[PDB]
């Protein structure tokens, strides 16, 4: 079977117990996440051995807490308190595991699925090779001997307008907020990187990235976490948004592909 589940952030008993729930057995099933594996919740360094140890039964995109946790390994950024991540950067294996992490992807595809899978989805400016090709520099970035530069030049609001003629640090930053830290576009598809709020909440003239049609999402469906403040709602036919905000006092929810079921861990704390 394949699972789908959204961002874990920390909450490693939750995702344990989800994972029971539906009988999780690597070897007969996969299991998709969208990213935040870390931050906020208690446990963000069970939840790295544990999804490192999966294997090929696992299929994970790289969300921004990812990437921050990464910026602050590398010396890049500062930790903050509220993050919890003290346990995972002291432990004795955390060389070994931020190094599997930054060589992780940013974008999942499933061609007989016809399913396609980043943190925070597509933006409807990218056509599927636009978002691979992407999507596999900034994953050659990462995995790179270098990649404590480019964790420093990602950090960033502009450009918000994709554009083929893109190069260096505006296109790196560009593809980085695409993947992990869109939510709303302007009508002509363009990146808003300041509202977090639901779609009833945001003022016009923004749309949810989905809402606009796109390429990639005419032909496939897209699975993407990210948004909590959307708890997983309106999303039309196609779009799967698997963050129920766990880390949040919400929930931890798993999607099975092969009959769209859905299975939710309430959250503990
Ligand atoms: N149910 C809810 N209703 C309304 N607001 C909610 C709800 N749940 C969480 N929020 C608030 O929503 C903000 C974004 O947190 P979040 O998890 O959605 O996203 P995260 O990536 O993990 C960090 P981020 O800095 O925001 O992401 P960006 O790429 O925009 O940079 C954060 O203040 C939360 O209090
Ligand atoms: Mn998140
Ligand atoms: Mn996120």
Known sequence: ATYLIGDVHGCYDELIALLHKVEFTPGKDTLWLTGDLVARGPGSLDVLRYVKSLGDSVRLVLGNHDLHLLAVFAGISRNKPKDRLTPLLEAPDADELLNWLRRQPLLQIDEE??????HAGITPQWDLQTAKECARDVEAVLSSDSYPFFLDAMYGDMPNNWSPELRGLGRLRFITNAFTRMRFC???????????????????????????????????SIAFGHWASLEGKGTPEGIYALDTGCCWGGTLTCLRWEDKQYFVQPSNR
């Open 113 to 118: 699925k016809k399913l396609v899978m980043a």
């Open 186 to 220: 302007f009508p002509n598809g363009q990146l808003d990187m300041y509202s977090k709020e639901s779609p009833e909440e945001a003022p016009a003239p923004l749309k949810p990235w989905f809402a606009i049609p796109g390429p990639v999402a005419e032909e496939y």
